[PDB]
Amino acid sequence: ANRAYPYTRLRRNRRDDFSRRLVRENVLTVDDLILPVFVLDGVNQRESIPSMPGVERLSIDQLLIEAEEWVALGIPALALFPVTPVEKKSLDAAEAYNPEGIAQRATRALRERFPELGIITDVALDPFTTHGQDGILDDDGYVLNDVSIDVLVRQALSHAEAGAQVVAPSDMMDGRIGAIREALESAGHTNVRIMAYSAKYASAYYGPFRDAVGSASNLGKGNKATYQMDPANSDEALHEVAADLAEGADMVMVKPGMPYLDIVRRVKDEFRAPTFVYQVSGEYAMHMGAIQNGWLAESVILESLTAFKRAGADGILTYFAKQAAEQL
Amino acid sequence: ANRAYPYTRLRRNRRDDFSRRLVRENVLTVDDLILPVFVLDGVNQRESIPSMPGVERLSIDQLLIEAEEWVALGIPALALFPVTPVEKKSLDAAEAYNPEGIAQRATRALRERFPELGIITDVALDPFTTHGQDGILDDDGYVLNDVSIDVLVRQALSHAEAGAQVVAPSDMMDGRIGAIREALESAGHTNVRIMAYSAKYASAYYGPFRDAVGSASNLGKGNKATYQMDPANSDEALHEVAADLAEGADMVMVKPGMPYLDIVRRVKDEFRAPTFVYQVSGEYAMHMGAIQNGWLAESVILESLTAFKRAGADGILTYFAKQAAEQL
Amino acid sequence: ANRAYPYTRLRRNRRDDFSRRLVRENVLTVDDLILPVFVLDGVNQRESIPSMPGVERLSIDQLLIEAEEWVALGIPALALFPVTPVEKKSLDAAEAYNPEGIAQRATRALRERFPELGIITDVALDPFTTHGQDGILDDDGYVLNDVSIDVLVRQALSHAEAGAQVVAPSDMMDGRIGAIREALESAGHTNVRIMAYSAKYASAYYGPFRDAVGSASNLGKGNKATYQMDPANSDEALHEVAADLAEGADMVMVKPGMPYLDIVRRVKDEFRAPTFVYQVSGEYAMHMGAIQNGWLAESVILESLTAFKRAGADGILTYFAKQAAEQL
Amino acid sequence: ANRAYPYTRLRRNRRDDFSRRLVRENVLTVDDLILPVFVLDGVNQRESIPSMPGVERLSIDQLLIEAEEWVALGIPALALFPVTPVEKKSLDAAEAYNPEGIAQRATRALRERFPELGIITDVALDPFTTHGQDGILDDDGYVLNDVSIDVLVRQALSHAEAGAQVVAPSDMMDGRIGAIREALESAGHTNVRIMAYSAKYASAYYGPFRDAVGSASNLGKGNKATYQMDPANSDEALHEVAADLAEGADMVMVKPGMPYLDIVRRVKDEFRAPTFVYQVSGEYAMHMGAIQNGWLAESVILESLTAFKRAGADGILTYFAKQAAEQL
Amino acid sequence: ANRAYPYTRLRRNRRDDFSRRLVRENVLTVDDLILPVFVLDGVNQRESIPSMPGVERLSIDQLLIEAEEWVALGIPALALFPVTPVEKKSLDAAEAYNPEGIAQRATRALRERFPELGIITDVALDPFTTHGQDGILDDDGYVLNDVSIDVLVRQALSHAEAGAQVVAPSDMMDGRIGAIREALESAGHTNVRIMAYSAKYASAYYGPFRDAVGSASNLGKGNKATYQMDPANSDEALHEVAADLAEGADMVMVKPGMPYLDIVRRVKDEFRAPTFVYQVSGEYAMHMGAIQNGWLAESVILESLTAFKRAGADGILTYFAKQAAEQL
Ligand SMILES: *[C@@H](CCC(=O)O)[C@@H](C)NC(C)=O
Ligand SMILES: *[C@@H](CCC(=O)O)[C@@H](C)NC(C)=O
Ligand SMILES: *[C@@H](CCC(=O)O)[C@@H](C)NC(C)=O
Ligand SMILES: *[C@@H](CCC(=O)O)[C@@H](C)NC(C)=O
Ligand SMILES: *[C@@H](CCC(=O)O)[C@@H](C)NC(C)=O
Ligand SMILES: [Mg+2]
Ligand SMILES: [Mg+2]
Ligand SMILES: [Mg+2]
Ligand SMILES: [Mg+2]
Ligand SMILES: [Mg+2]
Ligand SMILES: [Mg+2]
Ligand SMILES: [Mg+2]
Ligand SMILES: [Mg+2]
Ligand SMILES: [Mg+2]
Ligand SMILES: [Mg+2]
Ligand SMILES: [Mg+2]
Ligand SMILES: [Mg+2]
Ligand SMILES: [Mg+2]
Ligand SMILES: [Mg+2]
Ligand SMILES: [Mg+2]
Ligand SMILES: [Mg+2]
Ligand SMILES: [Mg+2]
Ligand SMILES: [Mg+2]
Ligand SMILES: [Mg+2]
Ligand SMILES: [Mg+2]
How far is C272 from chain E (nearest CA, A)? Predict the structure, then answer.
């Protein structure tokens, strides 16, 4: 609009707190926060994760206890990640759909205790396979697409049966959203939301999640690269999201987060649909490490989360959800 | 994105409060609120306005007292509207730039008492002319454009001298923003913001403001129609805003509000600049009347304000600012 | 284009390395890298920076020696940051334009020794003021815009006189690019490029830079907030860039980097001009801390830089430039 | 953005090599190169092609030997073109799907010897028909669309059975991509890519390919014009590409190349999908002829390939792939 | 528009000549052709150019004779290129503005003999400098921008004085179009058109032009690269064109041609202004070489020219203009 100095001085609105508040484009609130939680089997168990300072793996009893504080803070949902015992792992990932699996038990307990709390279950095979890869392997070690979808569908159904309001398919198999949707619709789970991990990249930022859960130790290399997206590609993410919306997803997600803010922006602008983003384990760890060392002020936590809002995210999966909910 | 029932059911996200909160596109906060206030001369004066139930005209001492509660609620700014004594009115609108006028006195007092509170003064001649029209009249009763700008410029300078952080030129004279900007820059008032009333319509919704201030009793007819915009025109508002941004405005405003939400949307989308909207006296009165009669629930207040945010407004001038700041 | 599973399987292109390479949208090369360097006064001085593991402050002799390896690796440019002795600081920031200042001496030495190496000098007052703020302060501690520009202009001229091919104004004063351009043109420095820090945010990610240089210890708060951009604002960055291009900038920059990738994307798309991004000290430190702790694989370095390319950056200022130039 | 001389001088970035490198918009790499190769029957056979100086037709043993150097150079894929013996030609193009045809034998040999090398087979009937036209002819000499698709489908299946990672249907029959996709999916060849020749023009630039392979001697005239695109049409190419993506293509191609760079640009911009371009035999020959004559410097080779990248191509089929891979 | 096989078969319109003609998007006509001609000093001189088979350098008498046939064919304009005698070359390029220079003499003769024929003179210093570079050199061999513009302005004025309807500034100096326009307007040459070479690349395709004229023997390397555009850059061409239109150009040109068709497309789409393209000497030579060798049919000539029309060119500078005008 032909704005020119000195008629236009962009510092005027910045002069005072009141005018900064008046022109501020985005605001972060507790409504934007989803807390991922690592869930152990057994009872009375709490375990620190060395590569995620401050994060604990919790047995279900402990989870129920901690959840009361998260509900009180107004965090709208949890994303559950079971820490499967090694003895429950198999080549067919059968534990994924065990009605008495950790995820199913934890969902039933939380739905009963806190009916208004959102439970987002993880539809994925990596915590259940002996090899820790994100699906069923053929003879050459390749993750079979359609065979893996059969297991994911059973898993999603078992989560719906346990009372999950949202199932979140996080393994990058083609066409899984449509298959899971068809199965939920056919079984009468009309209102179970699907939060698709639509543009999930072959990233090294998932490093600490291995320590937390005990899944694949290989990250961002040749095996993952046959289903997770190449970090170099942006246009391809639009094709991923378009397919997931056509297949019935209620929400779509970009993962990792901060290293992919341009993707969040393009996805929100292109589809105008509910868009989510995951601030992953490695993003949490690198921030925490710098804070603990006195290299960065604790204020980077809210700045990092404000960035997701500005980029177009409706909600953010973040291990900082509790700390953020206090600072807000 | 080829979304189709039953794969897509838009009710799933609506099923539960937590998912509604996760997908909610806009949130209203106290940062979005500007409270207009009617200011009397003298001391220890409070007067109810019959056509604006609940709104009082206040002398400066009373204003200072009430402002403490508004600051406490976190309202970022006030928009001052002096109620000029009839004996101070003139054909040349000289009281507009009186260093001891109500607006100037009130600004000095508030800037000293509450340094962080935003003061938005009204750059307009209607409260100062004997005839109550929005400028200086020629022999035929026509509001002269450039002669009126000379007075507005002096008025804006007097507001800057009194300490106003923002001057808000509300009479629709062409080119006034550039003239006021040049004068402020030349006088060294480098950081005084200009909140232009850019797309201000020839509306009947200003009815109760006459009762509040004692300005022109004619609204939305032949005289006003020679400077205020025709309610039928939308494209013309884009040309108004473009000119005001080129001339140096820091913020641009649409007025009235709810009857012009499509204009707020087009202005925000077209220019991506700080966009404000005025929920005028008549919008306040019609809501209040219906609430008092038991015809509408008090919840329409937050719904009306949420509409401005959804349409693209960064801030809202609203007589409901105090009530809203409590309900939020 | 109505792409649907199973006719469309986005995994097919991901199946093999050769097809991933064929469809890869972006490639990072040494041509994209700019190395920031901290320069000490004196001779035979090297100092480790505790909050930036692996980064050293170097006297000019040491810089000349290290630069031979950077040139050999094919890094196209350095961005110089002098570490001003406390005794050279003043209220008028006079050392900024000292023909014998560290930046000027280092520029002359490098231009002579490596004629093809790009030297990007820092046009900024924070390393030269006693208080460490980004300009000249008035009585209230406010950074004066136009008075600061007078000093920046002299500084930019002194850099051009020392042989700098690029001057990079990094303090967010309004209109500085036009003022610096007019002065360079009037003095006959027709080909000195201006790399504007156009959208530079009021960020906490600059933490370790304080330790490196000894500038302002306050970051992302009330003083910085009167000139650096609010992290919440995206549209405002487009207005910043538009002004800098109109004023004559040859290149425009977003800072910080990864937490602002959506801004890089919008700026590149909106203006189609040479766009740069700064992976700042705090981004370097948090990555390095996690790598050193064994929490993240060293591969996150190339992933972080690939993200800037994918988002639309033409070049990247990064303390990882040497390590990246080897891994590429 | 109101850029004006002399504030803006576009020569500043051009002044020095380092700044040219910093602002360079596109870079060509070996990852962008696909080498077409002409394959003979028999053993120990190498034949020069007079109209393609430097290009040889090779028997499979020779191809295996030469391929080691191409793999070493990092060329990601070959596009195979069999030179069918006259005695193997027929009206029903049966040799197209012979499990012991040249293309099938060459694919099996290369997949075994170099597992990481991409093999792109040619799905086309012109090398197999007695008449050399691109399909099966009816009584009037018209190329029948759906009858030709039946043969192409068998051919594509035979290539998948031989181990081809990519099948590239190059005869312009309507709907062939969908038919080939359905057949591959139904047969369990889930990951065989389809590189569609989507916008293939009725061009005279294919002249030397006749000499290389021995297919149709008529080019760009009345018969070809009933399936290949009219050189005058641009919008029509968007409809061709849209259909091929809907039908399941993993990659889409424009052919010829340089005379159709505007088409490459429109296709990439319109669909944001993996886009390929063929620098055909005639483009190779005209460049080579001029180089050999001393009329053009050898640098036109990299300039020609850089043009495809700038226009939006992800990969380039080019007889210059080996020479380019050395100069890069 | 959801077009799908077999409801949509794109071959139907291709079935018959009549329907191809009905849907053909672009048509080439003699109105699109501009013939470049090389002009010698003296009388009764014709010289063949070995690297441009079929092209002759002509003295003015011969040019006048040949022009009668070009006018008869309906070619709308000639672009004149003088072949300056070595004894007329100088460091100050003074022959460029000699009222008795070849270009000026040829213009006067042609304007008198064929008043309706368009004469496009070349505003450039390379045929007049001893060194053959495209401007006046400083001590370091750098082409000075503003000093070169002073000479170009005199040259353009001398062409207007000689009767040229169009002056075509072909040396890439910044701001030259505005300078030439101001001078023409101030001298009263109100209707002299400026055909700006706006996006002229640092290309190797100009090879044969050296043989024709005797200008710089260096092409597409380090000296040319400081003013001609980098072949890798597309967005930059939009900035070049925008500046030339703002400065007063009546027509804008892309050069070279076929290797830059994507640029022609972007320029036409972005500005909707009269857009021209130069099919340069090297494009002519490579086509001619292949035709003479029997490698390409003569039909590639019309296909090459049809490509420029399809890409968005209004007119084409082409050495094939006479041959094309016959085949059309
Ligand atoms: C994503 C990783 C989350 C994190 O790193 O914090 C989840 C769904 N699991 C895997 C195996 O990628
Ligand atoms: C606008 C009217 C506000 C209202 O009606 O509440 C102001 C600036 N004044 C006039 C006279 O229109
Ligand atoms: C930017 C900070 C760079 C960093 O943190 O690495 C520079 C130009 N200086 C300041 C004071 O912000
Ligand atoms: C295209 C021609 C390639 C070339 O000319 O180099 C191929 C697929 N075949 C035909 C017959 O057009
Ligand atoms: C352009 C070259 C034309 C050609 O190669 O045919 C002209 C204007 N001159 C130069 C020196 O580039
Ligand atoms: Mg997984
Ligand atoms: Mg997917
Ligand atoms: Mg949002
Ligand atoms: Mg939200
Ligand atoms: Mg008024
Ligand atoms: Mg106006
Ligand atoms: Mg808003
Ligand atoms: Mg707001
Ligand atoms: Mg600074
Ligand atoms: Mg700025
Ligand atoms: Mg780029
Ligand atoms: Mg680059
Ligand atoms: Mg064919
Ligand atoms: Mg087709
Ligand atoms: Mg590309
Ligand atoms: Mg590529
Ligand atoms: Mg020239
Ligand atoms: Mg130019
Ligand atoms: Mg046209
Ligand atoms: Mg034309």
Answer: 6
The residues near D240 (Cβ < 8 Å, ≥ 6 apart) are: D198, D199, D229, E10
Q: For helices C261-271 and C300-311, give the axis angle rounded to 10 degrees.
A: 30
User: Could you please report the per-residue DSSP string of E150-186?
Assistant: HHHHHHHHHHHHHT-SEEEE-S--TTHHHHHHHHHHH
Buried b (16+ CB within 10 A) or exposed e, A244-258: bbbbbbbbbbbbbbb
Please tell me the CATH code under which domain B1-328 is placed: 3.20.20.70
**C24, C26, C29, C32: CA torsion to nearest 10:** -170
**What single letter denotes the amino acid at residue B225?**
A
Separation CA B70–CA C9 (nearest Å): 58
Q: Is B89 one of the catalytic residues?
A: no
The distance of Cα D258 from the centroid of its chain, to the nearest Å, equals 13
Tell me whether C3 touches chain E (CB under 8 Å): no
Contact A235 D273 (CB under 8 A): yes
- Using CB atoms, which residue from E4, E145, E235 is nearest to C190? E145
State the sign of the Cα–Cα–Cα–Cα dihedral A176, A177, A178, A184.
Answer: positive
D150 in Cβ contact with D158 (< 8 Å) = no
Decide: E230 and D21 in contact? Cβ < 8 Å: no
Q: Are B160 and B184 in contact, with CB atoms under 8 Å apart?
A: yes
Distances (CA, A) of B67 to A196, B73, D314: 49, 10, 63
Give the separation between CA A8 and CA B252, rounded to whole angstroms.
Answer: 13
Other CB atoms within a 10 A radius of the CB of residue A214 amount to: 17
Distances (CA, A) of A217 to A41, C41, C198: 21, 47, 41
Q: Do D239 and E3 touch (CB under 8 A)?
A: yes
Q: Distance (Å) from the C-alpha of residue E244 to the closest C-alpha of chain D? A: 10
Identify the CA nearest to E158 among candidates E58, E82, E56: E82
Amino acid present at C186: S
Are the CB atoms for A269 and A243 separated by under 8 Å?
no
Q: Provide the experimental method for this PDB entry.
A: X-ray
Contacts of A26 in chain C (CB under 8 A): 232-234
Exposure letters D198-219 (e unless 16+ CB within 10 A, then b): bbbbbbbbbbbbbbbbbbbeeb
Active-site residue, E255 included: yes
CA distance B109 to D76: 75
Omega cis (within 30) before C231: no
| Domain assignments of chain B as residue spans, ordered by start | 1-328
224-253 in B: which are within 8 Å (CB) of A? Answer: 241-242, 245-248, 250-251
D124, two tokens: 């086309």
Question: Which residues from C are below 8 Å from A225, CB to CB?
Answer: 14, 17, 20
Which residues are within 8 A (CB) of C46 and not within 5 positions of it... i.e. 6 or more apart?
C56, C57, C58, C59, C62
Strands B46-48 and A275-279, sheet pairing: unpaired
CA distances from B290 to B206, B323, C319 (A): 18, 16, 63
Q: Number of C-alpha atoms within 13 angstroms, CB side, residue C175?
A: 20
Q: Which residues of D16-25 are buried (b: 16+ CB within 10 A; e: fewer)?
A: bebbbbbbbe
Beta partners for residue B229, in sequence order: B201
State the DSSP string of B9-52: -THHHHSSHHHHHHH------GGGEEEEEEEESSSS-EEE-TTS
Strands (E), C153-231: 166-169, 193-200
Handedness of CA B301, B306, B311, B315 (dihedral sign): positive
Cα of B301 to ligand 13 centre, how many Å?
A: 17
Q: A143 forms bridges with which residues in the sheet?
A: A137
Q: CB of A163 within 8 Å of any CB in chain B?
A: no
C235/B273 Cβ within 8 A: yes
Helices (H), chain A: 11-14, 17-23, 60-73, 102-113, 145-162, 176-186, 207-213, 235-246, 261-271, 281-293, 300-311, 321-327
